[PDB]
Amino acid sequence: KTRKESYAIYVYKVLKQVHPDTGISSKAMSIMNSFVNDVFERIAGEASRLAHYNKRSTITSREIQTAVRLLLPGELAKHAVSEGTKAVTKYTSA
Amino acid sequence: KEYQLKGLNWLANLYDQGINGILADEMGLGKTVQSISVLAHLAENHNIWGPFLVVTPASTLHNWVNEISKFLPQFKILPYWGNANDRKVLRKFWDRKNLRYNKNAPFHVMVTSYQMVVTDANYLQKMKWQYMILDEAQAIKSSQSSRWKNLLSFHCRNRLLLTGTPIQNSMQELWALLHFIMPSLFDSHDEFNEWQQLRRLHMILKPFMLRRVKKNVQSELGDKIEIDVLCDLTQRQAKLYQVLKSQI
Amino acid sequence: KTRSSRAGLQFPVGRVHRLLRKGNYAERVGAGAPVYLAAVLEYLTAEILELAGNAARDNKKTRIIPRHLQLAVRNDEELNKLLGRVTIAQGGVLPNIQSVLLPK
Amino acid sequence: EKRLEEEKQDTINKLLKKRAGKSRFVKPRRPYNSEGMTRILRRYEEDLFCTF
DNA sequence: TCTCCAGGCACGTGTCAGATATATACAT
DNA sequence: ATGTATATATCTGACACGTGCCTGGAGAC
Protein backbone atom coordinates (compact mmCIF):
# COMPACT_ATOMS: atom_id res chain seq x y z
CA LYS A 1 0.00 0.00 0.00
CA THR A 2 0.91 3.68 0.14
CA ARG A 3 3.55 4.89 2.60
CA LYS A 4 1.66 7.60 4.44
CA GLU A 5 3.70 10.15 6.39
CA SER A 6 2.44 10.96 9.88
CA TYR A 7 4.05 11.60 13.27
CA ALA A 8 1.17 10.00 15.19
CA ILE A 9 3.38 7.43 16.92
CA TYR A 10 5.78 10.18 18.08
CA VAL A 11 3.04 12.18 19.78
CA TYR A 12 1.54 8.87 20.98
CA LYS A 13 4.55 7.81 22.96
CA VAL A 14 5.55 11.22 24.28
CA LEU A 15 1.98 11.03 25.62
CA LYS A 16 2.89 7.58 26.96
CA GLN A 17 6.18 8.91 28.39
CA VAL A 18 4.66 11.85 30.25
CA HIS A 19 1.25 10.22 31.01
CA PRO A 20 1.82 6.45 31.41
CA ASP A 21 -1.87 5.64 32.11
CA THR A 22 -3.81 7.73 29.59
CA GLY A 23 -5.54 6.71 26.36
CA ILE A 24 -6.24 8.47 23.08
CA SER A 25 -8.43 8.23 19.96
CA SER A 26 -7.65 8.28 16.23
CA LYS A 27 -9.44 11.61 15.62
CA ALA A 28 -7.02 13.10 18.17
CA MET A 29 -4.02 11.78 16.17
CA SER A 30 -5.45 13.40 13.04
CA ILE A 31 -6.16 16.63 14.92
CA MET A 32 -2.70 17.24 16.32
CA ASN A 33 -1.21 15.96 13.07
CA SER A 34 -3.02 18.97 11.58
CA PHE A 35 -1.55 21.05 14.45
CA VAL A 36 2.09 20.07 13.95
CA ASN A 37 2.22 20.46 10.19
CA ASP A 38 0.24 23.73 10.55
CA VAL A 39 2.95 25.17 12.80
CA PHE A 40 5.68 23.38 10.80
CA GLU A 41 4.79 25.21 7.57
CA ARG A 42 4.02 28.44 9.46
CA ILE A 43 7.41 28.70 11.18
CA ALA A 44 9.24 27.21 8.16
CA GLY A 45 7.78 30.03 6.08
CA GLU A 46 8.46 32.69 8.71
CA ALA A 47 12.17 31.89 8.94
CA SER A 48 12.29 31.65 5.13
CA ARG A 49 10.96 35.20 4.50
CA LEU A 50 13.02 36.58 7.45
CA ALA A 51 16.32 35.10 6.21
CA HIS A 52 15.47 36.42 2.71
CA TYR A 53 14.68 39.81 4.31
CA ASN A 54 18.15 39.50 5.95
CA LYS A 55 19.31 38.54 2.39
CA ARG A 56 20.98 35.42 3.89
CA SER A 57 20.76 32.32 1.64
CA THR A 58 20.55 29.61 4.35
CA ILE A 59 18.79 28.45 7.54
CA THR A 60 20.94 27.80 10.61
CA SER A 61 19.86 28.05 14.25
CA ARG A 62 19.99 31.88 14.19
CA GLU A 63 17.10 32.64 11.80
CA ILE A 64 14.74 30.08 13.37
CA GLN A 65 15.88 31.29 16.82
CA THR A 66 14.73 34.85 16.15
CA ALA A 67 11.63 33.50 14.37
CA VAL A 68 10.53 31.49 17.41
CA ARG A 69 11.48 34.39 19.70
CA LEU A 70 9.28 36.67 17.57
CA LEU A 71 6.33 34.54 16.43
CA LEU A 72 4.30 32.97 19.26
CA PRO A 73 2.78 35.27 21.99
CA GLY A 74 4.80 34.21 25.05
CA GLU A 75 5.82 31.68 27.73
CA LEU A 76 6.26 28.72 25.36
CA ALA A 77 8.96 30.70 23.54
CA LYS A 78 10.66 31.43 26.89
CA HIS A 79 10.99 27.73 27.62
CA ALA A 80 11.43 26.87 23.92
CA VAL A 81 14.59 28.83 23.12
CA SER A 82 16.24 27.51 26.30
CA GLU A 83 15.34 23.88 25.60
CA GLY A 84 16.31 24.21 21.93
CA THR A 85 19.71 25.64 22.82
CA LYS A 86 20.12 22.79 25.31
CA ALA A 87 19.17 20.35 22.51
CA VAL A 88 21.75 21.71 20.07
CA THR A 89 24.41 21.60 22.79
CA LYS A 90 23.71 17.90 23.41
CA TYR A 91 23.94 17.45 19.64
CA THR A 92 27.31 19.21 19.42
CA SER A 93 28.42 17.37 22.56
CA ALA A 94 27.74 14.07 20.78
CA LYS B 1 -34.58 -46.54 13.75
CA GLU B 2 -36.57 -46.58 17.00
CA TYR B 3 -40.03 -45.77 18.35
CA GLN B 4 -39.15 -42.09 17.79
CA LEU B 5 -39.85 -42.58 14.07
CA LYS B 6 -43.46 -43.24 15.06
CA GLY B 7 -43.20 -40.34 17.50
CA LEU B 8 -42.16 -38.02 14.67
CA ASN B 9 -44.99 -39.52 12.60
CA TRP B 10 -47.31 -38.34 15.38
CA LEU B 11 -45.47 -35.00 15.20
CA ALA B 12 -46.20 -34.90 11.46
CA ASN B 13 -49.84 -35.71 12.25
CA LEU B 14 -50.11 -32.73 14.61
CA TYR B 15 -48.24 -30.65 12.01
CA ASP B 16 -50.96 -31.67 9.53
CA GLN B 17 -53.56 -30.64 12.12
CA GLY B 18 -51.84 -27.24 12.23
CA ILE B 19 -51.07 -26.95 15.96
CA ASN B 20 -47.49 -26.47 17.15
CA GLY B 21 -46.26 -29.00 19.69
CA ILE B 22 -43.99 -29.22 22.75
CA LEU B 23 -41.65 -32.13 23.43
CA ALA B 24 -41.40 -32.47 27.23
CA ASP B 25 -38.95 -35.39 27.27
CA GLU B 26 -35.62 -35.48 29.07
CA MET B 27 -32.41 -35.40 27.04
CA GLY B 28 -30.60 -38.68 26.51
CA LEU B 29 -32.44 -40.34 23.63
CA GLY B 30 -31.00 -38.15 20.88
CA LYS B 31 -33.61 -35.53 20.04
CA THR B 32 -31.24 -33.93 17.50
CA VAL B 33 -31.29 -36.86 15.07
CA GLN B 34 -35.07 -37.03 15.45
CA SER B 35 -35.27 -33.30 14.67
CA ILE B 36 -33.20 -33.70 11.51
CA SER B 37 -35.31 -36.76 10.66
CA VAL B 38 -38.36 -34.46 10.96
CA LEU B 39 -36.54 -32.04 8.64
CA ALA B 40 -35.74 -34.78 6.10
CA HIS B 41 -39.27 -36.22 6.29
CA LEU B 42 -40.83 -32.81 5.62
CA ALA B 43 -38.34 -32.31 2.78
CA GLU B 44 -39.44 -35.67 1.37
CA ASN B 45 -43.11 -34.77 1.88
CA HIS B 46 -43.54 -31.21 0.58
CA ASN B 47 -40.08 -30.64 -1.03
CA ILE B 48 -38.63 -27.87 1.13
CA TRP B 49 -34.88 -27.20 1.37
CA GLY B 50 -35.13 -23.52 2.27
CA PRO B 51 -35.68 -21.60 5.52
CA PHE B 52 -34.88 -23.67 8.60
CA LEU B 53 -33.77 -21.85 11.76
CA VAL B 54 -32.16 -23.67 14.69
CA VAL B 55 -31.99 -21.77 17.98
CA THR B 56 -29.29 -23.40 20.08
CA PRO B 57 -26.97 -22.42 22.98
CA ALA B 58 -23.29 -21.80 22.29
CA SER B 59 -22.17 -24.94 24.13
CA THR B 60 -24.31 -27.13 21.84
CA LEU B 61 -23.87 -25.06 18.64
CA HIS B 62 -20.83 -26.97 17.37
CA ASN B 63 -22.39 -30.20 18.66
CA TRP B 64 -25.47 -29.54 16.49
CA VAL B 65 -23.20 -28.65 13.55
CA ASN B 66 -21.20 -31.87 13.97
CA GLU B 67 -24.35 -34.00 14.33
CA ILE B 68 -25.98 -32.55 11.21
CA SER B 69 -22.65 -32.95 9.39
CA LYS B 70 -22.03 -36.63 10.13
CA PHE B 71 -25.66 -37.77 10.08
CA LEU B 72 -27.29 -35.94 7.14
CA PRO B 73 -24.67 -34.15 5.00
CA GLN B 74 -27.07 -33.54 2.11
CA PHE B 75 -28.02 -29.99 3.13
CA LYS B 76 -25.80 -26.90 3.33
CA ILE B 77 -24.83 -25.85 6.85
CA LEU B 78 -24.32 -22.17 7.68
CA PRO B 79 -23.26 -21.05 11.18
CA TYR B 80 -23.82 -17.72 12.92
CA TRP B 81 -21.02 -16.84 15.35
CA GLY B 82 -18.06 -14.49 15.19
CA ASN B 83 -17.22 -10.83 14.79
CA ALA B 84 -18.99 -8.04 12.90
CA ASN B 85 -17.01 -8.70 9.70
CA ASP B 86 -18.22 -12.30 9.70
CA ARG B 87 -21.67 -10.94 10.58
CA LYS B 88 -21.84 -8.79 7.45
CA VAL B 89 -20.24 -11.57 5.37
CA LEU B 90 -23.01 -13.96 6.46
CA ARG B 91 -25.53 -11.14 5.95
CA LYS B 92 -24.33 -11.03 2.35
CA PHE B 93 -24.50 -14.84 2.30
CA TRP B 94 -28.25 -15.04 3.04
CA ASP B 95 -29.43 -12.15 0.85
CA ARG B 96 -32.12 -14.44 -0.66
CA LYS B 97 -34.95 -12.16 -1.87
CA ASN B 98 -36.77 -15.34 -2.93
CA LEU B 99 -39.45 -16.64 -0.57
CA ARG B 100 -41.21 -20.06 -0.30
CA TYR B 101 -38.87 -22.90 -1.41
CA ASN B 102 -35.50 -22.81 -3.16
CA LYS B 103 -33.21 -25.73 -4.01
CA ASN B 104 -29.90 -24.05 -4.94
CA ALA B 105 -29.84 -21.99 -1.75
CA PRO B 106 -27.12 -21.44 0.88
CA PHE B 107 -29.54 -21.13 3.84
CA HIS B 108 -30.52 -24.82 4.13
CA VAL B 109 -29.35 -25.22 7.75
CA MET B 110 -29.12 -22.09 9.92
CA VAL B 111 -27.84 -22.34 13.50
CA THR B 112 -27.62 -19.40 15.91
CA SER B 113 -27.55 -18.52 19.61
CA TYR B 114 -29.89 -16.65 21.93
CA GLN B 115 -27.54 -13.71 22.54
CA MET B 116 -26.88 -13.14 18.83
CA VAL B 117 -30.61 -13.30 18.13
CA VAL B 118 -31.13 -10.76 20.94
CA THR B 119 -28.42 -8.35 19.76
CA ASP B 120 -29.81 -8.30 16.20
CA ALA B 121 -33.40 -7.20 16.89
CA ASN B 122 -33.39 -4.60 14.11
CA TYR B 123 -31.80 -7.08 11.68
CA LEU B 124 -33.75 -10.28 12.42
CA GLN B 125 -37.14 -8.53 12.18
CA LYS B 126 -36.88 -9.04 8.40
CA MET B 127 -36.46 -12.35 6.43
CA LYS B 128 -39.62 -14.01 7.80
CA TRP B 129 -39.00 -17.67 8.51
CA GLN B 130 -40.92 -20.88 7.82
CA TYR B 131 -39.52 -23.15 10.56
CA MET B 132 -37.74 -22.50 13.86
CA ILE B 133 -36.46 -25.15 16.27
CA LEU B 134 -35.37 -23.86 19.68
CA ASP B 135 -33.22 -26.21 21.77
CA GLU B 136 -32.60 -26.07 25.55
CA ALA B 137 -35.59 -23.83 26.26
CA GLN B 138 -34.96 -23.32 29.98
CA ALA B 139 -33.79 -19.74 29.31
CA ILE B 140 -37.23 -18.55 28.15
CA LYS B 141 -39.03 -19.51 31.37
CA SER B 142 -39.95 -15.86 32.04
CA SER B 143 -42.12 -13.52 29.97
CA GLN B 144 -40.10 -10.50 31.17
CA SER B 145 -37.04 -11.58 29.16
CA SER B 146 -36.02 -9.39 26.23
CA ARG B 147 -35.16 -12.54 24.24
CA TRP B 148 -38.74 -13.75 24.77
CA LYS B 149 -40.10 -10.45 23.43
CA ASN B 150 -37.72 -10.63 20.46
CA LEU B 151 -38.83 -14.17 19.62
CA LEU B 152 -42.46 -13.08 20.01
CA SER B 153 -42.00 -10.43 17.31
CA PHE B 154 -41.12 -12.87 14.51
CA HIS B 155 -43.37 -13.53 11.51
CA CYS B 156 -43.09 -17.32 11.13
CA ARG B 157 -46.10 -18.80 13.04
CA ASN B 158 -44.32 -22.11 13.73
CA ARG B 159 -43.19 -22.73 17.29
CA LEU B 160 -41.92 -26.29 17.78
CA LEU B 161 -39.86 -26.39 20.97
CA LEU B 162 -37.07 -28.64 22.26
CA THR B 163 -36.33 -28.80 26.00
CA GLY B 164 -35.39 -31.28 28.69
CA THR B 165 -37.80 -30.16 31.41
CA PRO B 166 -40.44 -27.43 30.86
CA ILE B 167 -41.87 -27.85 34.36
CA GLN B 168 -39.40 -25.54 36.13
CA ASN B 169 -42.10 -23.13 37.38
CA SER B 170 -45.73 -24.22 36.98
CA MET B 171 -47.24 -20.78 37.62
CA GLN B 172 -46.38 -18.52 34.67
CA GLU B 173 -44.10 -20.57 32.40
CA LEU B 174 -46.88 -22.96 31.31
CA TRP B 175 -49.00 -19.96 30.28
CA ALA B 176 -45.95 -18.55 28.47
CA LEU B 177 -45.34 -21.72 26.45
CA LEU B 178 -49.06 -22.08 25.69
CA HIS B 179 -49.02 -18.46 24.49
CA PHE B 180 -45.98 -19.20 22.31
CA ILE B 181 -47.78 -22.25 20.87
CA MET B 182 -50.83 -20.17 19.87
CA PRO B 183 -50.67 -16.38 20.44
CA SER B 184 -54.31 -15.96 19.35
CA LEU B 185 -55.86 -18.19 22.02
CA PHE B 186 -53.83 -17.18 25.09
CA ASP B 187 -53.01 -13.54 25.88
CA SER B 188 -54.26 -12.94 29.46
CA HIS B 189 -52.84 -14.82 32.45
CA ASP B 190 -55.77 -13.96 34.74
CA GLU B 191 -58.17 -16.25 32.87
CA PHE B 192 -55.49 -18.96 32.95
CA ASN B 193 -55.03 -18.54 36.71
CA GLU B 194 -58.75 -18.50 37.54
CA TRP B 195 -59.59 -21.33 35.13
CA GLN B 196 -59.16 -31.00 42.87
CA GLN B 197 -56.22 -28.84 41.80
CA LEU B 198 -53.83 -31.78 41.31
CA ARG B 199 -56.32 -33.92 39.37
CA ARG B 200 -57.55 -31.22 36.98
CA LEU B 201 -54.10 -29.94 35.97
CA HIS B 202 -53.09 -33.14 34.15
CA MET B 203 -56.08 -33.04 31.78
CA ILE B 204 -55.23 -29.49 30.63
CA LEU B 205 -51.94 -30.44 28.95
CA LYS B 206 -52.95 -34.01 28.01
CA PRO B 207 -53.28 -33.87 24.15
CA PHE B 208 -50.04 -31.93 23.57
CA MET B 209 -47.23 -33.65 25.50
CA LEU B 210 -46.12 -37.22 24.90
CA ARG B 211 -45.66 -39.69 27.76
CA ARG B 212 -42.20 -41.27 27.68
CA VAL B 213 -39.97 -42.34 30.57
CA LYS B 214 -36.27 -43.18 30.52
CA LYS B 215 -36.84 -46.72 31.85
CA ASN B 216 -38.25 -48.37 28.74
CA VAL B 217 -35.08 -49.56 26.94
CA GLN B 218 -32.26 -51.93 27.90
CA SER B 219 -30.72 -50.22 30.94
CA GLU B 220 -27.07 -50.57 29.97
CA LEU B 221 -26.65 -46.80 30.41
CA GLY B 222 -25.49 -47.41 33.98
CA ASP B 223 -28.52 -47.18 36.32
CA LYS B 224 -27.19 -44.05 38.03
CA ILE B 225 -27.39 -44.35 41.81
CA GLU B 226 -27.20 -41.36 44.14
CA ILE B 227 -24.74 -41.43 47.05
CA ASP B 228 -25.00 -38.43 49.38
CA VAL B 229 -21.93 -37.74 51.54
CA LEU B 230 -22.53 -35.72 54.70
CA CYS B 231 -19.62 -34.27 56.69
CA ASP B 232 -18.89 -31.89 59.57
CA LEU B 233 -17.34 -28.44 59.49
CA THR B 234 -13.76 -27.69 60.49
CA GLN B 235 -12.82 -25.20 63.20
CA ARG B 236 -11.73 -22.77 60.48
CA GLN B 237 -15.20 -23.20 58.95
CA ALA B 238 -16.90 -23.05 62.37
CA LYS B 239 -16.12 -19.58 63.75
CA LEU B 240 -16.67 -17.89 60.36
CA TYR B 241 -20.42 -18.43 60.79
CA GLN B 242 -20.36 -16.46 64.05
CA VAL B 243 -18.09 -13.91 62.34
CA LEU B 244 -20.63 -13.34 59.55
CA LYS B 245 -23.52 -13.32 62.05
CA SER B 246 -21.64 -10.98 64.41
CA GLN B 247 -22.07 -7.81 62.34
CA ILE B 248 -25.78 -8.47 61.71
CA LYS C 1 23.34 5.60 15.66
CA THR C 2 20.32 7.71 14.75
CA ARG C 3 20.86 11.47 14.84
CA SER C 4 17.74 12.04 16.97
CA SER C 5 19.25 9.80 19.66
CA ARG C 6 22.55 11.67 19.26
CA ALA C 7 20.71 14.94 19.87
CA GLY C 8 18.99 13.43 22.91
CA LEU C 9 15.58 14.37 21.50
CA GLN C 10 12.50 12.26 20.88
CA PHE C 11 10.81 13.99 17.93
CA PRO C 12 12.62 12.85 14.77
CA VAL C 13 15.35 14.95 13.21
CA GLY C 14 15.84 13.12 9.91
CA ARG C 15 12.15 13.40 9.03
CA VAL C 16 12.04 17.18 9.48
CA HIS C 17 15.36 17.44 7.59
CA ARG C 18 13.79 15.47 4.71
CA LEU C 19 10.72 17.72 4.80
CA LEU C 20 13.02 20.77 4.89
CA ARG C 21 15.03 19.69 1.84
CA LYS C 22 12.11 19.30 -0.58
CA GLY C 23 9.84 21.72 1.29
CA ASN C 24 11.34 24.52 -0.88
CA TYR C 25 12.14 26.95 1.94
CA ALA C 26 15.89 27.51 1.52
CA GLU C 27 18.48 26.23 -0.93
CA ARG C 28 21.01 25.69 1.89
CA VAL C 29 20.05 24.27 5.29
CA GLY C 30 22.18 24.18 8.44
CA ALA C 31 22.56 21.19 10.72
CA GLY C 32 21.13 22.70 13.91
CA ALA C 33 17.95 24.14 12.40
CA PRO C 34 16.04 20.79 12.10
CA VAL C 35 17.11 20.01 15.68
CA TYR C 36 15.74 23.38 16.78
CA LEU C 37 12.49 22.70 14.88
CA ALA C 38 12.15 19.31 16.58
CA ALA C 39 12.89 20.92 19.95
CA VAL C 40 10.25 23.65 19.66
CA LEU C 41 7.77 21.10 18.28
CA GLU C 42 8.42 18.75 21.21
CA TYR C 43 7.98 21.66 23.63
CA LEU C 44 4.67 22.75 22.05
CA THR C 45 3.11 19.28 22.06
CA ALA C 46 4.53 18.59 25.54
CA GLU C 47 2.80 21.73 26.85
CA ILE C 48 -0.58 20.98 25.31
CA LEU C 49 -0.30 17.31 26.24
CA GLU C 50 0.06 18.42 29.86
CA LEU C 51 -2.98 20.65 29.27
CA ALA C 52 -4.99 17.81 27.70
CA GLY C 53 -3.93 15.55 30.57
CA ASN C 54 -5.17 17.89 33.28
CA ALA C 55 -8.38 18.46 31.31
CA ALA C 56 -8.77 14.66 31.05
CA ARG C 57 -8.37 14.14 34.80
CA ASP C 58 -10.61 17.17 35.39
CA ASN C 59 -13.39 15.45 33.44
CA LYS C 60 -12.18 12.03 34.77
CA LYS C 61 -11.78 10.31 31.41
CA THR C 62 -8.96 8.06 30.25
CA ARG C 63 -9.29 9.16 26.60
CA ILE C 64 -8.68 12.76 25.55
CA ILE C 65 -11.63 13.83 23.39
CA PRO C 66 -10.98 16.94 21.22
CA ARG C 67 -13.39 18.80 23.56
CA HIS C 68 -10.78 18.28 26.29
CA LEU C 69 -8.24 20.12 24.17
CA GLN C 70 -10.84 22.85 23.52
CA LEU C 71 -11.13 23.68 27.19
CA ALA C 72 -7.38 23.09 27.52
CA VAL C 73 -6.64 25.64 24.77
CA ARG C 74 -9.22 28.16 26.02
CA ASN C 75 -7.83 28.22 29.58
CA ASP C 76 -4.60 30.10 28.76
CA GLU C 77 -4.26 33.47 27.04
CA GLU C 78 -1.05 32.57 25.17
CA LEU C 79 -2.84 29.90 23.12
CA ASN C 80 -6.00 32.02 23.11
CA LYS C 81 -3.89 34.48 21.11
CA LEU C 82 -1.94 31.85 19.18
CA LEU C 83 -5.05 29.79 18.32
CA GLY C 84 -7.76 32.43 18.54
CA ARG C 85 -8.22 32.97 14.80
CA VAL C 86 -8.27 29.20 14.14
CA THR C 87 -11.52 27.27 13.57
CA ILE C 88 -11.85 23.82 15.12
CA ALA C 89 -14.14 21.04 13.92
CA GLN C 90 -16.31 19.69 16.77
CA GLY C 91 -15.13 22.20 19.33
CA GLY C 92 -18.25 23.54 20.99
CA VAL C 93 -18.49 26.65 23.14
CA LEU C 94 -16.78 27.15 26.49
CA PRO C 95 -19.14 27.94 29.42
CA ASN C 96 -19.50 31.73 29.41
CA ILE C 97 -22.72 33.50 30.44
CA GLN C 98 -22.82 37.23 31.17
CA SER C 99 -23.98 38.36 34.61
CA VAL C 100 -26.46 40.85 33.13
CA LEU C 101 -27.97 38.17 30.85
CA LEU C 102 -28.71 35.97 33.87
CA PRO C 103 -32.08 36.66 35.53
CA LYS C 104 -32.18 38.53 38.87
CA GLU D 1 -13.28 -10.68 -17.09
CA LYS D 2 -12.27 -8.50 -14.14
CA ARG D 3 -15.74 -8.63 -12.57
CA LEU D 4 -15.93 -12.43 -12.88
CA GLU D 5 -12.45 -12.81 -11.36
CA GLU D 6 -13.38 -10.45 -8.50
CA GLU D 7 -16.61 -12.40 -7.89
CA LYS D 8 -14.70 -15.71 -7.90
CA GLN D 9 -12.12 -14.32 -5.45
CA ASP D 10 -14.88 -12.97 -3.18
CA THR D 11 -16.72 -16.32 -3.29
CA ILE D 12 -13.50 -18.20 -2.47
CA ASN D 13 -12.76 -15.82 0.42
CA LYS D 14 -16.32 -16.16 1.74
CA LEU D 15 -16.15 -19.97 1.49
CA LEU D 16 -12.80 -20.01 3.32
CA LYS D 17 -14.16 -17.71 6.03
CA LYS D 18 -17.28 -19.88 6.41
CA ARG D 19 -15.15 -23.04 6.64
CA ALA D 20 -12.87 -21.44 9.25
CA GLY D 21 -15.85 -20.22 11.26
CA LYS D 22 -17.71 -23.54 11.05
CA SER D 23 -15.05 -26.26 11.33
CA ARG D 24 -11.94 -24.41 12.54
CA PHE D 25 2.94 -35.73 26.63
CA VAL D 26 6.25 -36.35 28.43
CA LYS D 27 7.55 -33.42 30.46
CA PRO D 28 11.15 -32.30 29.80
CA ARG D 29 13.91 -33.14 32.24
CA ARG D 30 15.77 -30.66 34.41
CA PRO D 31 18.69 -28.97 32.60
CA TYR D 32 21.82 -30.60 33.98
CA ASN D 33 24.66 -28.07 34.09
CA SER D 34 28.26 -28.60 35.23
CA GLU D 35 31.09 -26.37 34.00
CA GLY D 36 34.52 -26.38 35.62
CA MET D 37 33.51 -29.36 37.72
CA THR D 38 35.51 -32.55 38.26
CA ARG D 39 33.81 -35.72 37.09
CA ILE D 40 33.77 -39.27 38.44
CA LEU D 41 32.42 -42.08 36.25
CA ARG D 42 31.68 -45.58 37.53
CA ARG D 43 30.87 -48.25 34.93
CA TYR D 44 30.73 -52.04 34.85
CA GLU D 45 34.30 -52.57 33.63
CA GLU D 46 36.15 -49.31 34.33
CA ASP D 47 36.09 -46.13 36.40
CA LEU D 48 37.12 -42.59 35.53
CA PHE D 49 38.34 -39.54 37.46
CA CYS D 50 38.43 -36.50 35.19
CA THR D 51 40.26 -33.77 37.11
CA PHE D 52 41.52 -30.27 36.37
C1' DT E 1 26.70 10.61 -4.46
C1' DC E 2 27.52 5.09 -3.22
C1' DT E 3 26.17 1.82 0.14
C1' DC E 4 23.27 -0.65 3.63
C1' DC E 5 20.60 -1.97 7.27
C1' DA E 6 17.14 -1.42 10.76
C1' DG E 7 12.97 2.20 12.03
C1' DG E 8 8.69 2.66 11.28
C1' DC E 9 4.45 1.04 8.75
C1' DA E 10 1.16 -2.78 8.02
C1' DC E 11 -1.34 -6.86 9.48
C1' DG E 12 -2.64 -10.69 12.50
C1' DT E 13 -4.06 -12.40 17.64
C1' DG E 14 -5.35 -12.22 23.41
C1' DT E 15 -7.26 -9.39 27.18
C1' DC E 16 -10.02 -6.42 30.54
C1' DA E 17 -14.85 -3.33 30.32
C1' DG E 18 -20.47 -3.25 29.50
C1' DA E 19 -25.17 -6.05 28.99
C1' DT E 20 -28.83 -9.63 30.15
C1' DA E 21 -29.95 -13.07 33.55
C1' DT E 22 -30.73 -16.02 37.69
C1' DA E 23 -32.58 -15.79 42.46
C1' DT E 24 -34.09 -15.79 46.89
C1' DA E 25 -34.63 -13.80 51.19
C1' DC E 26 -35.47 -9.20 53.44
C1' DA E 27 -37.60 -4.75 53.91
C1' DT E 28 -40.80 -1.34 52.59
C1' DA F 1 -46.94 -6.89 46.44
C1' DT F 2 -42.75 -5.44 44.78
C1' DG F 3 -37.93 -3.42 44.78
C1' DT F 4 -33.39 -4.89 45.57
C1' DA F 5 -28.68 -6.49 46.63
C1' DT F 6 -25.06 -8.64 45.54
C1' DA F 7 -22.83 -12.42 43.65
C1' DT F 8 -23.31 -15.39 39.65
C1' DA F 9 -23.02 -17.05 34.49
C1' DT F 10 -22.52 -16.17 29.56
C1' DC F 11 -20.86 -13.35 26.47
C1' DT F 12 -19.70 -9.98 23.20
C1' DG F 13 -16.73 -5.64 22.26
C1' DA F 14 -13.15 -2.35 21.80
C1' DC F 15 -8.33 -2.08 22.65
C1' DA F 16 -2.86 -3.24 22.85
C1' DC F 17 1.20 -6.64 21.46
C1' DG F 18 4.24 -10.23 18.02
C1' DT F 19 5.93 -10.98 12.97
C1' DG F 20 7.28 -9.22 7.82
C1' DC F 21 9.58 -5.49 4.74
C1' DC F 22 11.43 -1.82 2.34
C1' DT F 23 13.28 2.24 1.86
C1' DG F 24 15.27 6.19 3.36
C1' DG F 25 18.39 8.01 7.01
C1' DA F 26 23.17 7.44 8.29
C1' DG F 27 28.44 6.49 7.40
C1' DA F 28 31.99 7.79 4.16
C1' DC F 29 34.19 10.54 0.36
Automatic annotation (TrEMBL), chain C:
Entry's Gene Ontology molecular function annotations: DNA binding; protein heterodimerization activity; structural constituent of chromatin
Keywords from the named record: Acetylation, Chromosome, DNA-binding, Isopeptide bond, Nucleosome core, Nucleus, Phosphoprotein, Ubl conjugation
Domain Histone H2A C-terminal per the UniProt entry, residue ranges: 77-104
Superkingdom of source: Eukaryota
Gene Ontology terms: biological process: heterochromatin formation
UniProt key word Acetylation: yes
Compartments where found: Chromosome; Nucleus
GO CC terms, sorted: nucleosome; nucleus
Domain Core Histone H2A/H2B/H3: 1-74
Entry's family note: Belongs to the histone H2A family.
Function, in words: Core component of nucleosome. Nucleosomes wrap and compact DNA into chromatin, limiting DNA accessibility to the cellular machineries which require DNA as a template. Histones thereby play a central role in transcription regulation, DNA repair, DNA replication and chromosomal stability. DNA accessibility is regulated via a complex set of post-translational modifications of histones, also called histone code, and nucleosome remodeling.
Complex formation: The nucleosome is a histone octamer containing two molecules each of H2A, H2B, H3 and H4 assembled in one H3-H4 heterotetramer and two H2A-H2B heterodimers. The octamer wraps approximately 147 bp of DNA.
UniProt-recorded name of the protein: Histone H2A
Annotated organism of origin: Xenopus laevis
Region of the whole protein represented: 16 to 119 of 130
